[PDB]
Design a protein around this motif. Structure first.
Motif, PDB file in Angstrom:
ATOM      1  N   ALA A   7      56.830  27.359  76.995  1.00  0.00           N
ATOM      2  CA  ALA A   7      56.884  27.480  75.540  1.00  0.00           C
ATOM      3  C   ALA A   7      56.448  26.195  74.835  1.00  0.00           C
ATOM      4  N   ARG A   8      56.773  25.047  75.430  1.00  0.00           N
ATOM      5  CA  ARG A   8      56.416  23.764  74.851  1.00  0.00           C
ATOM      6  C   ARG A   8      54.912  23.559  74.820  1.00  0.00           C
ATOM      7  N   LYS A   9      54.174  24.178  75.748  1.00  0.00           N
ATOM      8  CA  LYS A   9      52.716  24.158  75.680  1.00  0.00           C
ATOM      9  C   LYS A   9      52.204  24.805  74.404  1.00  0.00           C
ATOM     10  N   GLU A  10      52.827  25.899  73.977  1.00  0.00           N
ATOM     11  CA  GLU A  10      52.402  26.576  72.762  1.00  0.00           C
ATOM     12  C   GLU A  10      52.758  25.781  71.513  1.00  0.00           C
ATOM     13  N   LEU A  11      53.940  25.157  71.508  1.00  0.00           N
ATOM     14  CA  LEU A  11      54.288  24.243  70.415  1.00  0.00           C
ATOM     15  C   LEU A  11      53.310  23.075  70.318  1.00  0.00           C
ATOM     16  N   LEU A  12      52.922  22.498  71.455  1.00  0.00           N
ATOM     17  CA  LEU A  12      51.947  21.416  71.455  1.00  0.00           C
ATOM     18  C   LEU A  12      50.561  21.884  71.058  1.00  0.00           C
ATOM     19  N   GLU A  13      50.250  23.163  71.262  1.00  0.00           N
ATOM     20  CA  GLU A  13      49.005  23.707  70.734  1.00  0.00           C
ATOM     21  C   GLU A  13      49.026  23.785  69.218  1.00  0.00           C
ATOM     22  N   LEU A  14      50.149  24.210  68.644  1.00  0.00           N
ATOM     23  CA  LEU A  14      50.207  24.351  67.192  1.00  0.00           C
ATOM     24  C   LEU A  14      50.258  23.006  66.473  1.00  0.00           C
ATOM     25  N   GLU A  15      50.935  22.019  67.057  1.00  0.00           N
ATOM     26  CA  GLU A  15      50.983  20.696  66.449  1.00  0.00           C
ATOM     27  C   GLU A  15      49.624  20.014  66.430  1.00  0.00           C
ATOM     28  N   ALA A  16      48.727  20.393  67.340  1.00  0.00           N
ATOM     29  CA  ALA A  16      47.361  19.891  67.323  1.00  0.00           C
ATOM     30  C   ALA A  16      46.625  20.331  66.072  1.00  0.00           C
ATOM     31  N   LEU A  17      46.752  21.611  65.715  1.00  0.00           N
ATOM     32  CA  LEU A  17      46.114  22.124  64.509  1.00  0.00           C
ATOM     33  C   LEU A  17      46.724  21.514  63.255  1.00  0.00           C
ATOM     34  N   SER A  18      48.051  21.332  63.252  1.00  0.00           N
ATOM     35  CA  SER A  18      48.712  20.679  62.122  1.00  0.00           C
ATOM     36  C   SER A  18      48.234  19.245  61.937  1.00  0.00           C
ATOM     37  N   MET A  19      48.135  18.479  63.022  1.00  0.00           N
ATOM     38  CA  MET A  19      47.644  17.111  62.941  1.00  0.00           C
ATOM     39  C   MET A  19      46.179  17.045  62.540  1.00  0.00           C
ATOM     40  N   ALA A  20      45.379  18.028  62.961  1.00  0.00           N
ATOM     41  CA  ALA A  20      43.981  18.077  62.548  1.00  0.00           C
ATOM     42  C   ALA A  20      43.850  18.290  61.049  1.00  0.00           C
TER      43      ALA A  20
ATOM     44  N   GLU B  13      48.364  22.578  54.932  1.00  0.00           N
ATOM     45  CA  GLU B  13      47.130  23.007  54.288  1.00  0.00           C
ATOM     46  C   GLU B  13      47.200  22.848  52.779  1.00  0.00           C
ATOM     47  N   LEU B  14      48.335  23.202  52.181  1.00  0.00           N
ATOM     48  CA  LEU B  14      48.439  23.117  50.727  1.00  0.00           C
ATOM     49  C   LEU B  14      48.537  21.678  50.228  1.00  0.00           C
ATOM     50  N   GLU B  15      49.210  20.809  50.981  1.00  0.00           N
ATOM     51  CA  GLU B  15      49.300  19.408  50.589  1.00  0.00           C
ATOM     52  C   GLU B  15      47.954  18.702  50.635  1.00  0.00           C
ATOM     53  N   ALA B  16      47.020  19.200  51.446  1.00  0.00           N
ATOM     54  CA  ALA B  16      45.664  18.671  51.467  1.00  0.00           C
ATOM     55  C   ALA B  16      44.964  18.895  50.140  1.00  0.00           C
ATOM     56  N   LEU B  17      45.082  20.107  49.591  1.00  0.00           N
ATOM     57  CA  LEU B  17      44.476  20.411  48.301  1.00  0.00           C
ATOM     58  C   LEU B  17      45.138  19.627  47.177  1.00  0.00           C
ATOM     59  N   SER B  18      46.467  19.476  47.243  1.00  0.00           N
ATOM     60  CA  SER B  18      47.177  18.669  46.250  1.00  0.00           C
ATOM     61  C   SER B  18      46.729  17.213  46.277  1.00  0.00           C
ATOM     62  N   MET B  19      46.606  16.624  47.465  1.00  0.00           N
ATOM     63  CA  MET B  19      46.141  15.250  47.584  1.00  0.00           C
ATOM     64  C   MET B  19      44.691  15.090  47.153  1.00  0.00           C
ATOM     65  N   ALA B  20      43.862  16.109  47.391  1.00  0.00           N
ATOM     66  CA  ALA B  20      42.478  16.063  46.932  1.00  0.00           C
ATOM     67  C   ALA B  20      42.394  16.037  45.415  1.00  0.00           C
ATOM     68  N   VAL B  21      43.169  16.900  44.754  1.00  0.00           N
ATOM     69  CA  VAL B  21      43.200  16.937  43.291  1.00  0.00           C
ATOM     70  C   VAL B  21      43.735  15.627  42.724  1.00  0.00           C
ATOM     71  N   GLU B  22      44.835  15.127  43.290  1.00  0.00           N
ATOM     72  CA  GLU B  22      45.458  13.893  42.825  1.00  0.00           C
ATOM     73  C   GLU B  22      44.576  12.667  43.027  1.00  0.00           C
ATOM     74  N   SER B  23      43.681  12.671  44.010  1.00  0.00           N
ATOM     75  CA  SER B  23      42.779  11.534  44.144  1.00  0.00           C
ATOM     76  C   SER B  23      41.539  11.658  43.266  1.00  0.00           C
ATOM     77  N   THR B  24      40.942  12.854  43.205  1.00  0.00           N
ATOM     78  CA  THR B  24      39.728  12.997  42.422  1.00  0.00           C
ATOM     79  C   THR B  24      39.973  12.896  40.922  1.00  0.00           C
ATOM     80  N   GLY B  25      41.185  13.193  40.444  1.00  0.00           N
ATOM     81  CA  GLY B  25      41.467  13.036  39.032  1.00  0.00           C
ATOM     82  C   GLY B  25      41.490  11.587  38.596  1.00  0.00           C
ATOM     83  N   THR B  26      42.184  10.747  39.370  1.00  0.00           N
ATOM     84  CA  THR B  26      42.233   9.319  39.089  1.00  0.00           C
ATOM     85  C   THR B  26      40.853   8.686  39.168  1.00  0.00           C
TER      86      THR B  26
END
Lengths: 50, 50
Positions: A7-20, B13-26
Motif C-alpha cells: 500500500a505504501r508504494k501507492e501512497l508514494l506514487e501519489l505523493e510524486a504527482l503532488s510534489m510535481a 492544484e488550486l493553490e497553484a492557480l492562486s499563487m499564479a494570480v497573486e504573483s502576476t497581479g503584483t
C-alpha cells in the motif's frame, strides 16, 4: 510488512504527482510574472524612445 | 493516507492557480504604474523642449 509496503508504494506514487504539481506551480508563476513585467517595460521603452 | 493524498493533490492544484494570480497581479501593477509615469514625463519633456 509486505502488505503495508504494497500500500505504501501507492501512497508514494501519489505523493510524486503532488510534489510535481507543487513544484511546477511555483516555477510557472514566478516565471510568468517577471515575463509580464518585462513585456510592460519593453512596450513602455518604445514609446519613451519615440 | 492514500485517499488523503488524492484530495491533497487537488488542493495543491488550486493553490497553484492562486499563487499564479497573486504573483502576476503584483508584477502587472508595479510595471504599469511606472510605465504610465514614464509616459507622462516624456510627453512633458517634449513640451518643455519646445
Amino acid at each position: 510488512q509486505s502488505e503495508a509496503e504494497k500500500a505504501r508504494k501507492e501512497l508514494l506514487e501519489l505523493e510524486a504527482l503532488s510534489m510535481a504539481v507543487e513544484s511546477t506551480g511555483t516555477a510557472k508563476a514566478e516565471a510568468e510574472s517577471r515575463a509580464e513585467a518585462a513585456r510592460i517595460e519593453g512596450e513602455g521603452s518604445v514609446l519613451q524612445a519615440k
